[PDB]
Structure 1
Amino acid sequence: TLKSFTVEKGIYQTSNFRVQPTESIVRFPNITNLCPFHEVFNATTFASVYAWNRKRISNCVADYSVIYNFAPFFAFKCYGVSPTKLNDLCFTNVYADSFVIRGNEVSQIAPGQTGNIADYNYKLPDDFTGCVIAWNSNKLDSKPSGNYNYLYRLFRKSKLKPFERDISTEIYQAGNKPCNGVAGPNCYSPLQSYGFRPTYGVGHQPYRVVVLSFELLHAPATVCGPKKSTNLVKNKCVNFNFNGLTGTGVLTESNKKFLPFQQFGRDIADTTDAVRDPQTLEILDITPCSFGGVSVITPGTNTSNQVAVLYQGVNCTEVPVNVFQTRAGCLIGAEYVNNSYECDIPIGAGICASYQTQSQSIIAYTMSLGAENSVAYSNNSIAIPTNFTISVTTEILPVSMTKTSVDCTMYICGD
């Protein structure tokens, strides 16, 4: 730690100890349902662009390898989550949206993006989890006469909120003159068809999108991955997996008064204190495993190679990964003695240590403030000195330090 080969007399802080976790419990809700991914993933057609479909998936065990099995999609291109990390993460609710798109629309539908499609047809929220799966479906949407059953929306009075659907065949007027059943006198139909053709250009080929957007809430989680449940442990430093909330601590039985709608307890530093069990209605309190600093008490290596160890702030009945309990932790390697000397190596609240002859050893003691004195006071007694001494002492005071000068261009860059 000191980057040397000889140390001096003193107390040095070397590292920090920690009680390692022993077991690994995974608490997990038991559900036998299988999520309808295969059932409503493979379809012969999708809905319109302006009028898509929403599918609610809940309360089931989820599998995420079916995207490779069913659709020949190019890339996941996902925000906020890894495709291979979905196997462990337990979510709140899965939302499935399936609708066809045009070629110049894969990059158009994104959080924090605008255009013409995102204003009316399909709008994604700016902060969300889950993602968009897209591929090529040019031959999957090529009738010999072309596709016009899909409709397109381009006119509205104002903007449209994310995750919303528009179903209308009204008339919009760009002026104060109403039309009411006539199209063309300064008013046109907001509903427009699609020019999907087998002989069309490459820039507007028909594509397809299945959305699998998830959400992260403090709601009671229903849909999870496939995992296994493990029975409870108590008063042990153990890693836990309570509904995907991982960590490490000691799961003491809680004393609290949790209301029936409250599951998670919260810390001031944003961590968790108490967690509701996913298999019963018992609240259990989390406490972190024991830790602290470690200090090595040594004299100089020119004197001896004996050391003492101070584990700071622990009632060391749980020391490991002469034993004396101290106010400042506990001291291993030093013997407590009922004497009083001056302080050589300062340890804690009144305790010092030193290298003493009485075979050599490292001793620990409470330090002495000085010799006890009791000057004889009386109401008619005085003490007057008859001689004197002249003494010369020494006082040392720093005055100045080193003057330095640094330039940025030589230090940061160097020509």
Structure 2
Amino acid sequence: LKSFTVEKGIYQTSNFRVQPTESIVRFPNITNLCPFDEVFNATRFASVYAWNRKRISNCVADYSVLYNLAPFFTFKCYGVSPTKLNDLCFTNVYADSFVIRGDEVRQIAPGQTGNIADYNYKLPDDFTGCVIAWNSNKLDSKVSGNYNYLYRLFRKSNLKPFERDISTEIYQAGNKPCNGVAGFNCYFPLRSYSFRPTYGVGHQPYRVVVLSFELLHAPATVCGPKKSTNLVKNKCVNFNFNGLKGTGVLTESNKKFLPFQQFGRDIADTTDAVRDPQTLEILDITPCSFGGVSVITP
């Protein structure tokens, strides 16, 4: 009432809530460290149209080794926070490791426009992942140019995101027919930049790895390094189910989950039922006990 004297009657005051007693962390019991060395510490990085999509699943992705890796420095991320990257669980991770010109490194981003972003490697606008780059001028640039990397500056149309095009047929740049014969307005599509150590820093070759995550309501195969605890039922506790945090009471439930389903949602689109990742059991989440408090005084 913001007063020192209180009249008679009944006054509503602050509500009461049962605080959690313990904390539960529950992660799937994968014990294999993730092979990021085969993606990053590889001796040779493939070309642009050698669209090598490394599939990452059933890992324990410790990102501290990647953060303290010697060659790769930049760690740009969209949709997630890098300091949170050791705390989440992803269903599948996909890695794309290329070598690109440093002028178009900025084109490796959603919503960009250019030769690379149109005809080489396009990211979707709802891309949730990270981009990692290193100036690879010391290794991937050779004397008098390296011609292993190819670029298609002209095409019929732009590429849809996460697609590749390895067709070597001659595209008619002009309106005249070319009949599969090279010439004026009938150039070869896959040209090269021929990276040299004597080039400028903008035109130096760069090793780039794009990590794309899949944050869905699906069972998770990639998870950060975290130790799972025991399960406590019928008690108001804090919980962490596969990076999904909350506070409530976990109870046994008779919900008939489909085999592809992981989480359940109510009318208000909050999480109501979870699946325990270690033992396949369905748990209902109930908010802890609360209510209104009133003071009856003269």
TM-score, normalised relative to structure 2: 0.94
Question: Structure 1 residues 188, 111: closer, same or farther in 2, change over 3 A?
Answer: same
Deviates most, 121-130 or 43-52: 43-52
- Any gaps of 5 or more consecutive residues in structure 2? none
Is contact 2:135–2:205 with CA below 8 Å preserved after alignment?
Answer: yes
Which residue in 1 is equivalent to 2:135?
A: 136
2:99 alignment partner, SS class: strand
- How far apart are residue 74 of structure 1 and its match? 3.3
After TM superposition, what 4+ stretches of structure 1 lie above 4 angstroms from structure 2?
none
- How far apart are residue 176 of structure 1 and its match? 4.9
Is contact 2:154–2:189 with CA below 8 Å preserved after alignment?
Answer: yes
Rounded Cα–Cα distance in structure 1 between residues aligned with 2:225 and 2:69: 20
Question: Structure 1 residues 262, 202: closer, same or farther in 2, change over 3 A?
Answer: closer
Is contact 1:80–1:130 with CA below 8 Å preserved after alignment?
Answer: yes
Is contact 1:51–1:121 with CA below 8 Å preserved after alignment?
Answer: no
| Greater gyration radius | 1
Is contact 2:32–2:59 with CA below 8 Å preserved after alignment?
Answer: yes
Q: Please state if 1:192 is matched with 2:184.
A: no
- How far apart are residue 198 of structure 1 and its match? 2.2
Per-residue CA deviation, residues 5-37 of structure 1 (Å, 9 max, x unaligned), is 212122222211110001111112112222111
Rounded Cα–Cα distance in structure 1 between residues aligned with 2:39 and 2:185: 43
Is contact 2:90–2:221 with CA below 8 Å preserved after alignment?
Answer: yes
Rounded Cα–Cα distance in structure 1 between residues aligned with 2:111 and 2:176: 36
Is contact 1:89–1:224 with CA below 8 Å preserved after alignment?
Answer: yes
- How far apart are residue 45 of structure 1 and its match? 2.2
Question: Structure 1 residues 182, 128: closer, same or farther in 2, change over 3 A?
Answer: same
Rounded Cα–Cα distance in structure 2 between residues aligned with 1:30 and 1:198: 47
- How far apart are residue 143 of structure 1 and its match? 1.1
Per-residue CA deviation, residues 193-224 of structure 1 (Å, 9 max, x unaligned), is 11422222233121110112211112221111
How many residue pairs get aligned? The number is 298
- How far apart are residue 175 of structure 1 and its match? 4.4
Per-residue CA deviation, residues 336-364 of structure 1 (Å, 9 max, x unaligned), is xxxxxxxxxxxxxxxxxxxxxxxxxxxxx
Question: Structure 1 residues 98, 28: closer, same or farther in 2, change over 3 A?
Answer: same
Which structure is richer in relative contact order (CA contacts within 8 A, separation 6 or more)? 2
Is contact 2:218–2:261 with CA below 8 Å preserved after alignment?
Answer: no
Rounded Cα–Cα distance in structure 2 between residues aligned with 1:283 and 1:249: 15
Per-residue CA deviation, residues 343-393 of structure 1 (Å, 9 max, x unaligned), is xxxxxxxxxxxxxxxxxxxxxxxxxxxxxxxxxxxxxxxxxxxxxxxxxxx
Identity of aligned residues (%): 95
- How far apart are residue 120 of structure 1 and its match? 0.9
- How far apart are residue 237 of structure 1 and its match? 0.2
Is contact 1:50–1:120 with CA below 8 Å preserved after alignment?
Answer: no
2:103 alignment partner, SS class: helix
Is contact 2:129–2:213 with CA below 8 Å preserved after alignment?
Answer: yes
Matches within 5 A, 1:5-404: 5-299=4-298
TM-score, normalised relative to structure 1: 0.68
RMSD: 1.7
1:221 alignment partner, SS class: coil
Per-residue CA deviation, residues 124-159 of structure 1 (Å, 9 max, x unaligned), is 111021110012111222212222221111121122
- Any gaps of 5 or more consecutive residues in structure 1? 300-415
2:83 alignment partner, SS class: helix
2:239 alignment partner, SS class: strand
- How far apart are residue 52 of structure 1 and its match? 2.9
